Write a protein that binds this ligand. Sequence first.
Ligand SMILES: [Mg+2]
Ligand SMILES: [Mg+2]
Ligand SMILES: [Mg+2]
Ligand SMILES: [Mg+2]
Ligand SMILES: [Mg+2]
Ligand SMILES: [Mg+2]
Ligand SMILES: [Mg+2]
Ligand SMILES: [Mg+2]
Ligand SMILES: [Mg+2]
Ligand SMILES: [Mg+2]
Ligand SMILES: [Mg+2]
Ligand SMILES: [Mg+2]
Ligand SMILES: [Mg+2]
Ligand SMILES: [Mg+2]
Ligand SMILES: [Mg+2]
Ligand SMILES: [Mg+2]
Ligand SMILES: [Mg+2]
Ligand SMILES: [Mg+2]
Ligand SMILES: [Mg+2]
Ligand SMILES: [Mg+2]
Ligand SMILES: [Mg+2]
Ligand SMILES: [Mg+2]
Ligand SMILES: [Mg+2]
Ligand SMILES: [Mg+2]
Ligand SMILES: [Zn+2]
Lengths: 112, 229, 125, 109
Amino acid sequence: AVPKKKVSHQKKRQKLYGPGKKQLKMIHHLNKCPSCGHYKRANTLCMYCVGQISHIWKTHTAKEEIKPRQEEELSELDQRVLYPGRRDTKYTKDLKDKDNYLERRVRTLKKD
Amino acid sequence: TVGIARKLSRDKAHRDALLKNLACQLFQHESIVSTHAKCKEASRVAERIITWTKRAITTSNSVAQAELKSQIQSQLFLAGDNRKLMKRLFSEIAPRYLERPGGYTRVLRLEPRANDSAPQSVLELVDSPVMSESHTVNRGNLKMWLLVKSVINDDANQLPHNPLTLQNLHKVAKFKAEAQLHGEIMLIKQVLLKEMSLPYDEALENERTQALLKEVYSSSSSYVMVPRP
Amino acid sequence: MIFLKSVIKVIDNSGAQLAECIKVIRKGSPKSPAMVGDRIVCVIQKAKPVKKGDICHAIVVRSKQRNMCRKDGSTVAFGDTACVLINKNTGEPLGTRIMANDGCVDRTLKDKGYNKICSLASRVI
Amino acid sequence: KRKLISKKNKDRLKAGDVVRIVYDSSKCSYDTFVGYILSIDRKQLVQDASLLLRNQIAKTAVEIRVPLFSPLIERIDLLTPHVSSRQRNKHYYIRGTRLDVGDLEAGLR
RNA sequence: UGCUGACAUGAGUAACGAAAAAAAGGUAUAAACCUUUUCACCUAAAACAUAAGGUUUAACUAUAAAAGUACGGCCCCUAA
RNA sequence: UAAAGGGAAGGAACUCGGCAAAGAUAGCUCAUAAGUUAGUCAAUAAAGAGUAAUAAGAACAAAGUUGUACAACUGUUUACU
RNA sequence: AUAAUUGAGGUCCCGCAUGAAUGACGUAAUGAUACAACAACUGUCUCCCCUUUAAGCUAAGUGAAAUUGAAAUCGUAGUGA
RNA sequence: AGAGUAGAUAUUGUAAGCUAUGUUUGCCACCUUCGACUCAACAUUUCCUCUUGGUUGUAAAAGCUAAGAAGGGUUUGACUGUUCGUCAAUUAAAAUGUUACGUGAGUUGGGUUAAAUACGAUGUGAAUCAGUAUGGUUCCUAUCUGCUGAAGGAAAUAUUAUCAAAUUAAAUCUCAUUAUUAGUACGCAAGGACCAUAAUGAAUCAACCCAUGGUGUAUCUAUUGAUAAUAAUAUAAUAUAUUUAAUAUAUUAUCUAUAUUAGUUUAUAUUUUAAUUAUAUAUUAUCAUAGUAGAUAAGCUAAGUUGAUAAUAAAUAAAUAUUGAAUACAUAUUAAAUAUGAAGUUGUUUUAAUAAGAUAAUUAAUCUGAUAAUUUUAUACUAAAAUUAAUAAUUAUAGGUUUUAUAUAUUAUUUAUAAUUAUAAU
Ligand SMILES: [Mg+2]
Ligand SMILES: [Mg+2]
Ligand SMILES: [Mg+2]
Ligand SMILES: [Mg+2]
Ligand SMILES: [Mg+2]
Ligand SMILES: [Mg+2]
Ligand SMILES: [Mg+2]
Ligand SMILES: [Mg+2]
Ligand SMILES: [Mg+2]
Ligand SMILES: [Mg+2]
Ligand SMILES: [Mg+2]
Ligand SMILES: [Mg+2]
Ligand SMILES: [Mg+2]
Ligand SMILES: [Mg+2]
Ligand SMILES: [Mg+2]
Ligand SMILES: [Mg+2]
Ligand SMILES: [Mg+2]
Ligand SMILES: [Mg+2]
Ligand SMILES: [Mg+2]
Ligand SMILES: [Mg+2]
Ligand SMILES: [Mg+2]
Ligand SMILES: [Mg+2]
Ligand SMILES: [Mg+2]
Ligand SMILES: [Mg+2]
Ligand SMILES: [Zn+2]
């Protein structure tokens, strides 16, 4: 059930980094993207190009932002009177700063 | 039970629900992104559904027709945005594949997602019309778009087209009229140019497209095979 | 296939009605089943007024176990497992006739060499 | 022998049919058997198809599976065609209930 | 089997706590946040009203509105 | 490994011990002995019938009979063996 | 009573060392009590097989525990707190 | 000594003698759990099977006793916590041990040393017992050794692809019954062989899935109860085009099956009244253990199938011999020579590892491998194995597609083609 002795620095090292299985291999399998000569994994669509395509689709197949009929011609003063902007809670604020906790896809290097 | 299909770490009913759902979504949107495994199974379903639809369209036997229809109904959730899906399958989707023998769906490997390392894929219907009127382009077939982009890049660089690219183009063509294909390419190209920084000369582009089509359409070791002495 | 305290029909006129297998004779391990053609020791559990309680020998003549394979690629299975009482050291039927009411048996008995039993039987299937 | 058991033949053998299996006398010395077909066992390949048929003989049942293409069997004669009442492909369910076969030999007399 | 602090070993191991998810869009930022649709789960409840309790946790600082009648306290009256 | 489902021929041969797991042929209406402290206590008696059902066919209530020892009985007890 | 019984029930009385409110004696009912027998039913077993789900396994994210004189920690025979 | 119809030494063997073992009951005080299940490993003082000597007590057959021999094998029940023991049924036999009286970080916990309680006994009593009875508590994710598998690296008498011997590590090694020889030998009769062969099986092991049986959360059908859909049809609204003289007709699309009021408090239901607010319509789906039941393809499996139980041979053990001295005889040799002789040994057979040797290739428009993709013969991960064709040819890996086949359960009262009729057939 339990270790009989403190495992020596050597022994643990050799258990961990010793065998091949436990080592990270080098990703040899990667090649040029036909559309823009950047690196991409083999047998795999380039993540930039596809993303771009998706974006374009979104732009084209964008749904109509259903803006209400009343609020478009609603006086600024009137609006202020109606809907005064409150202070948001800490949690809400945190949620809002997406950049802090949310990751945007990185771009690869150019293959040569 | 063991080894007939994927299990996907879900009990029977739930799995079935998932797969039907995925099929429905694919029919709706033409292209979707999900985990590889899910895609792979979803395609199986979708293809089968398409074939059933085709059979229903074709076969003279009323009994057979009815049965196929029933099967199709069973294999879908026709409720919210899928309410008119039955109609869509027969009228819009199935006809595109009347001449094509299987292979109605295309699965393409993406990058594994960062947070989970789960291997992802695009699943999409093959020959999906890229141009809807009163809309410009449609949320269509990624592969075609990618090919077009590649072609554009090549043109920009003034390099010859890769053989692989040519092969892909040929494949795309096989079940496609030439003029139609050309039109589609043209439609794609302008949009791509707009997206990218590159400029757009219409006539020149058209010419290029024509050239590309022509090559596609009109077709053209150390070991010596010798008889036993 | 018959095992320890399996109960079986006696299809004989010895007066035994129902017998309970206590051992299989030729087979080495006591865990092993007795099948058609095999000789068993049994206790006589029920009899018409030999007596109940008598330990006697019997041959299993038919079984309910489908799966028993014949060389011609066929199988036969019965509605019950039945036996015929025999004589300890003679190996002949203890009864004079097999009950013609319910006296079918497996032709494998003939192959085995239980000719007396086979002839005694109303039908050999 | 193939024609009966063909899924394309209308007048085939069905669960419910009573049949007489006649063995060849030159090959073997087996008696002919009459039985109600509970099931025809069709297989991936053809020659190893069989049928499972039963008969009650004077207060005792007996079921037999016969390999239909065994050269031991000469021909099989349809005695009685099935009735439209009992429905299903395989009639195992009848054994032990009201629907059981009874004595086919007796019926024949 | 000192005491305190720091740092190891087991070990990047076990586990991550009753479990149904999917797509599209927010957002070429999302398994986990929000919205829509699909699917499911609880339903003499996992719902809707409440009592007690408590770092106000809430749909929040521009904040939880009462003369009283199927509104409670205090108040009057007592029980233990 | 856990929590389930099914299982031919056997049917307790298992085991300290049928532990565990099977096992319900109306849940309504009839019909229900011996014994007995005379309380349908026994009794929701067992068995059995009426309606339903003829081998394909929800879930839940409902799981036997008898002998002996001890204690009348419903209750209470070592929160955590 | 079982094919076969150190168990069970009945009876016999050298009660090693019963006995009358530390109650004595037989009974109905009751008991998740404790022994035993029969029926039925079964994976308990002959004898294990298949299937499902959650784990285990791999990838990503997080990330414990008892233990630890120091270890470069094989077998055998002999030796020896 | 003495038994043994005679005669100590076939078989028996008093008391006394000399030893061996550390399997019992003890003694010492160096040192602080019995059974069951599972899996067994080792020993030989051998229970069976193989070889053999002795046997007025070897006629034969059964035995008794002794030598060699550990290759294979050595049981299922009732009783009991039991190991044991008493029976029952078998078996060739049901051998005796050692392994912390093997095995609780492998299971169980019935016995047995706690707390509750009772009975008998002892005690004035609290309580006690080489008593009896019911109940009743430990857990552990494996660091190292070890073992079972599977990889990576590596040094190769120097490479790669493939084939690979010796060898090393193991496995295996059998047994019964029946029949023949033969009712022969032997024997008054009863009884009844060796030697040797064959056929059945027995246990054990391996492989397999054509069939058989099981399963089969992919497989359809049947079915109970509730809900939610899609399509069709009737109704209504709105939107969009058409015709008509915004209106009406009809076409297309979308949305809609509501809602309010009565019937003495509430809630629900019913019916009326209001409203366009519907189908004993087709087909689905969800949930109820896969809701339940009948069948069920692949795969996996045994209760199934198939095969093996490894020869021939070499040297031997106990034993049985030939000649033959030392020692004029005798002596199978603890002399020289020459022979028979066991399920044992060596070997063979089987699996795994290793890789001597062999064939070929050599810096490469497609050298040998890896990474990568699709995968299953393979699989925890790996590894193994198949494919990565799309050009002058040739090669299908998974999914799909087609094919025939299977599975389901209705179908000739049918489908298809031509005009209730003709032909081809499910
Ligand atoms: Mg210190
Ligand atoms: Mg570890
Ligand atoms: Mg682990
Ligand atoms: Mg884990
Ligand atoms: Mg959780
Ligand atoms: Mg997103
Ligand atoms: Mg309700
Ligand atoms: Mg609430
Ligand atoms: Mg036992
Ligand atoms: Mg027992
Ligand atoms: Mg109940
Ligand atoms: Mg009481
Ligand atoms: Mg008392
Ligand atoms: Mg009580
Ligand atoms: Mg991890
Ligand atoms: Mg010896
Ligand atoms: Mg241990
Ligand atoms: Mg230990
Ligand atoms: Mg208890
Ligand atoms: Mg099979
Ligand atoms: Mg099968
Ligand atoms: Mg529910
Ligand atoms: Mg065999
Ligand atoms: Mg080809
Ligand atoms: Zn790119």
